Amino acid sequence: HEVVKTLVEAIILVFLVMYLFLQNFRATLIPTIAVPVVLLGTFAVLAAFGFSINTLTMFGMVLAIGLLVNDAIVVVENVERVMAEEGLPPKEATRKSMGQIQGALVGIAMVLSAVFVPMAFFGGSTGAIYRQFSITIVSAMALSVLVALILTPALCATMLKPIAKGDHGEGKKGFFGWFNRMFEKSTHHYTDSVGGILRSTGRYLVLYLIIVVGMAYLFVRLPSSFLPDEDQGVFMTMVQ
Amino acid sequence: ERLSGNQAPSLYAISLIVVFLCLAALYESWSIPFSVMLVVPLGVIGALLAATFRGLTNDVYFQVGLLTTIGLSAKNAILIVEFAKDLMDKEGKGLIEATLDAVRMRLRPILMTSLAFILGVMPLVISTGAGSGAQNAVGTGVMGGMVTATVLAIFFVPVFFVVVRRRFSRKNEDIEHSH
Amino acid sequence: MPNFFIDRPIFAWVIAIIIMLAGGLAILKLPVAQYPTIAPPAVTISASY
Ligand SMILES: CCCCCCCCCCCCO[C@@H]1O[C@H](CO)[C@@H](O[C@H]2O[C@H](CO)[C@@H](O)[C@H](O)[C@H]2O)[C@H](O)[C@H]1O
Ligand SMILES: CCCCCCCCCCCCO[C@@H]1O[C@H](CO)[C@@H](O[C@H]2O[C@H](CO)[C@@H](O)[C@H](O)[C@H]2O)[C@H](O)[C@H]1O
């Protein structure tokens, strides 16, 4: 139940971060809706596979959220950027926003599942632990692509308020107008930063190599275990 | 144990191999997938830094959380590269020009994703109470991993892409062509 | 589909490679026998007097 609680909080924190960038309650609702649909669908798939609700399946639900929310934002925001650029109405704006990235969605989920599928095949008694998690994540990724092909596009066509051509919302009022006018922050300052690290490039490659080294260093020096001891609110005392 | 052995290396080796094969199909290229895979350390460094300087261990919850960071950072790297390439194909745009143009348009969606997630998983790192051990363990690695992945990859992915395209030539590019 | 992969030789190779390495791994873990189970199973009751 404690994991259920952080799961609900994770969704609410996602909903707030969605609302910070997309500043429409209508628009941040879209990705937020997708989460409950994909996650509840995943529980159903768990039942299909004869799995149980446990710490590892529950941690699947939680970790999947970054993956799911990514699917939603990718579709939603790509529409946002089709509207502020061609002044198109929501129904058409998403129709070829989808027609141009629906292949990507399917493709990417495919390569991503390669990260988790082999782990499903871990063997032994301690094998079911890694497998529960992999199936949960891959299931969620599947449903998330389904939801991104079915509900999300529909929700974009009927929930997204129109954006005029060129509009970037840089003068709403108070804070929101601030963050937008200042979102070009260094969308410009950053891309001039990137353009700089490209002219040289020579020794940005060397930095990478220390990171790979420090990684190798940190990794060999970090001890390994299985599952941590937990405080279960009880214990025993042996007397002999 | 005398049954155990070592699954780790080979399974992740298989994983890296199947991921590379998938990326190759995606971009129709044997080389370009490298620009996406070089991002794997950037997130592992955070996971190590996080777990290290919090006395954590390399256990089940460390391993699964890293997979996630790697997945989500792979995904952000792929979206940048997909658009940098599609601008050199459907548009004529040269390398450096189509690299920055893809970085600009994907900066927002990237930070949206990473922050919303980094922040969404913080109730796990801050957790006290029953099962808090597993919630703290799985949580901190992902957060540290995601933060390192998400700040580093934002600068390194553009570097990966151009460096790779300029070792596997074509000997025509770098001035924007004509469709 | 053929027109699709004629233009995408690499995608075709990865499909074939992934299939092969999938099968390669399969061979490492597969039981070996002359026959599978082909005999009908039997149960014997034994008693002594
Ligand atoms: C973001 C939304 C989607 C994610 C939400 C996922 C959270 C779900 C995890 C809950 C853990 C499962 O906990 C489960 O709870 C239900 C509801 O009390 C219990 O169900 C019990 O009460 C319900 C309703 O009162 C009865 O219909 C049921 O017959 C009874 O068994 C289960 O016996 C218990 O095992
Ligand atoms: C391409 C995408 C995926 C890339 C992922 C690359 C990074 C993955 C790193 C994961 C960490 C691997 O870390 C490895 O975990 C295995 C678990 O099987 C540990 O295994 C160890 O602990 C277990 C605990 O039950 C023992 O049973 C086992 O005998 C022992 O060797 C290794 O000591 C460790 O080195």
Side-chain angles (χ1 to χ4, degrees):
Chain A
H1 287 191
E2 286 284 9
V3 183
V4 170
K5 174 170 159 178
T6 87
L7 207 182
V8 170
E9 301 160 341
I11 297 171
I12 295 173
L13 290 152
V14 179
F15 172 79
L16 295 149
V17 184
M18 305 280 71
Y19 192 84
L20 180 66
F21 293 83
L22 333 155
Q23 288 148 305
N24 190 18
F25 196 91
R26 248 179 152 196
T28 77
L29 231 53
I30 298 177
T32 307
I33 289 167
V35 161
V37 176
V38 172
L39 259 44
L40 289 165
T42 305
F43 278 94
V45 174
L46 284 185
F49 287 56
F51 290 176
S52 79
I53 297 180
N54 56 74
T55 312
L56 278 147
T57 44
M58 284 303 302
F59 284 165
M61 301 305 179
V62 183
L63 293 185
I65 293 177
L67 296 173
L68 313 187
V69 167
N70 198 304
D71 280 339
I73 305 167
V74 153
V75 178
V76 175
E77 166 130 39
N78 192 30
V79 181
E80 299 287 67
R81 188 191 59 81
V82 168
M83 296 197 300
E85 267 72 358
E86 299 155 29
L88 288 176
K91 189 158 198 179
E92 280 77 14
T94 88
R95 191 189 300 273
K96 82 170 172 65
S97 194
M98 286 299 306
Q100 87 180 2
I101 78 161
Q102 68 184 12
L105 288 163
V106 172
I108 300 178
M110 217 76 201
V111 333
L112 262 35
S113 39
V115 173
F116 301 86
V117 165
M119 158 175 284
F121 292 86
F122 179 91
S125 275
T126 82
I129 275 155
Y130 295 89
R131 180 175 323 115
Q132 301 288 248
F133 184 94
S134 271
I135 317 290
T136 292
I137 295 279
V138 163
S139 301
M141 282 185 19
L143 295 176
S144 181
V145 163
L146 226 50
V147 172
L149 292 179
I150 301 179
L151 177 51
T152 302
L155 259 38
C156 283
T158 63
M159 281 201 179
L160 285 179
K161 263 194 165 61
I163 297 174
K165 210 225 174 201
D167 190 12
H168 272 265
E170 308 179 46
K172 144 59 178 303
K173 272 213 93 209
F175 163 64
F176 268 24
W178 180 69
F179 188 79
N180 294 343
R181 278 160 32 224
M182 92 173 304
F183 178 73
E184 74 177 38
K185 233 160 261 153
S186 61
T187 284
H188 297 65
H189 289 86
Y190 161 74
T191 56
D192 302 345
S193 274
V194 168
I197 74 189
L198 294 184
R199 174 214 65 221
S200 62
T201 296
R203 303 129 210 82
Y204 273 104
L205 248 58
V206 190
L207 195 164
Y208 179 79
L209 293 165
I210 275 302
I211 306 197
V212 181
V213 169
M215 178 207 70
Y217 178 81
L218 278 177
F219 173 84
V220 291
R221 177 169 290 84
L222 187 88
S224 64
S225 49
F226 184 51
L227 294 158
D229 290 326
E230 285 285 9
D231 191 315
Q232 312 199 0
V234 300
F235 67 84
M236 288 176 299
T237 296
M238 182 185 311
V239 171
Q240 265 278 348
Chain B
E1 306 324 322
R2 295 214 133 265
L3 274 58
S4 192
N6 289 282
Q7 313 281 5
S10 48
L11 281 179
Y12 292 133
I14 296 175
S15 202
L16 277 153
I17 296 159
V18 182
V19 162
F20 166 81
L21 290 163
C22 287
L23 287 159
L26 189 66
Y27 301 110
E28 185 59 13
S29 176
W30 294 120
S31 68
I32 294 176
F34 284 125
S35 72
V36 160
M37 305 200 69
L38 294 168
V39 83
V40 183
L42 297 185
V44 187
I45 195 66
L48 295 178
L49 272 177
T52 282
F53 294 105
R54 181 169 163 94
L56 253 39
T57 164
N58 183 287
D59 58 352
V60 166
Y61 298 133
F62 182 83
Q63 292 155 13
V64 298
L66 196 49
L67 253 48
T68 306
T69 321
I70 292 169
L72 200 61
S73 87
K75 190 175 192 314
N76 293 337
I78 293 171
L79 293 168
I80 290 176
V81 181
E82 246 298 329
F83 221 96
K85 185 165 180 277
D86 281 12
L87 283 178
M88 303 169 67
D89 295 339
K90 326 205 90 164
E91 317 304 331
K93 295 185 180 186
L95 180 64
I96 292 74
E97 178 191 342
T99 298
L100 271 58
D101 201 2
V103 165
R104 270 177 29 251
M105 305 164 53
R106 275 287 138 63
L107 187 287
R108 181 156 176 257
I110 283 183
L111 290 189
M112 285 192 71
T113 305
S114 312
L115 297 168
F117 183 56
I118 292 172
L119 197 89
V121 305
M122 133 169 288
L124 280 163
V125 310
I126 213 75
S127 177
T128 73
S132 178
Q135 293 204 40
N136 293 335
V138 80
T140 75
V142 172
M143 204 187 64
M146 282 295 299
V147 173
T148 64
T150 192
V151 294
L152 273 48
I154 220 79
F155 290 98
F156 273 102
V157 172
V159 170
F160 290 161
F161 185 75
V162 295
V163 164
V164 168
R165 297 308 307 277
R166 297 210 269 207
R167 182 137 204 173
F168 305 100
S169 47
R170 275 188 192 274
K171 219 148 303 186
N172 311 127
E173 114 95 33
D174 236 330
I175 334 287
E176 76 176 359
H177 221 270
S178 300
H179 59 71
Chain C
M1 190 163 73
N3 283 322
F4 182 75
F5 287 113
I6 287 183
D7 295 326
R8 296 152 187 89
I10 299 180
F11 195 153
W13 268 122
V14 327
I15 292 177
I17 289 157
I18 292 192
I19 291 186
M20 286 195 282
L21 75 82
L25 303 173
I27 287 172
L28 306 169
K29 241 163 181 281
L30 279 162
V32 180
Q34 187 196 353
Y35 297 122
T37 302
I38 56 187
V43 170
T44 295
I45 304 162
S46 306
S48 185
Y49 191 172

